[PDB]
Design a binder for this molecule. Sequence first.
Ligand code: HEM
Length: 243
Amino acid sequence: SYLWRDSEVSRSGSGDEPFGWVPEAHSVFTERILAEEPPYPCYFGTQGQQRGNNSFSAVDTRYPDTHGPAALARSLRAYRQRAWQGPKRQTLIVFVGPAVPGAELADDHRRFWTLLDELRAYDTEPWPADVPADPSDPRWQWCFDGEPWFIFAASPAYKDRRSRDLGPCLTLVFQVRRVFEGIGGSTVAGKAAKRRVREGLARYDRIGPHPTLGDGDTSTDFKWRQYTLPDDDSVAAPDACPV
Ligand code: HEM
């Protein structure tokens, strides 16, 4: 395991034990995404939360042999199975802790890429034949358990891009392709989804949508850039993926 529904996340926690800080990270996350004024910009995530469609896990950096990447690989395999049954719009939120006071965005980003690397070692499935393995390829995406994931990193060090601050921990948000059924970027519903989320971003964030966010007319190349947005509108070089 370590794959939890909301009800299964423990009620309170003892900071010194493995995952003893998770109750607090979970409360702050749920407070952020359910906040009513201004609303959390992604109404899909809010609704996911309200319907009980979000799952959770964690990594405890102090207990790597038992509550680390290997256990997360097992939890992701279980999540992948859950995500292809029942409702289409599910998300997995993974808290990485304990929180490190003072951490900068660069540091959180470094930790994010290290974890993705480490998870690779615990994959039981080969890299998908239809996604290139070179991360400098325009079509590269992170893959695990035989398919590509949609993934991004949230951090308290986001000051203007407040939408990506989900509480005190480095937080990973994972989804399978299924969540986008009917809302592909090129469709009328997909465009409506973009308009609606971006209106929410305008009122919640102090900086506008990042330039690497697609208009949805073409497949977006160098998706890696979207996993770890900067807090400004700088655009990284397509070929500088850190994995
Ligand atoms: C807890 C779950 C979720 C969170 C925390 C979340 C968070 C976000 C954030 C922060 C953005 C703004 C763009 C960015 O920073 O990358 C975003 C945009 C978006 N999200 Fe979510 N989201 C969640 C679940 C979902 C689900 C389940 C779907 C679809 C069913 C979805 C669809 C979208 C779409 C379509 C956009 C807009 C992309 C654009 O304007 O180009 N999200 N989400």
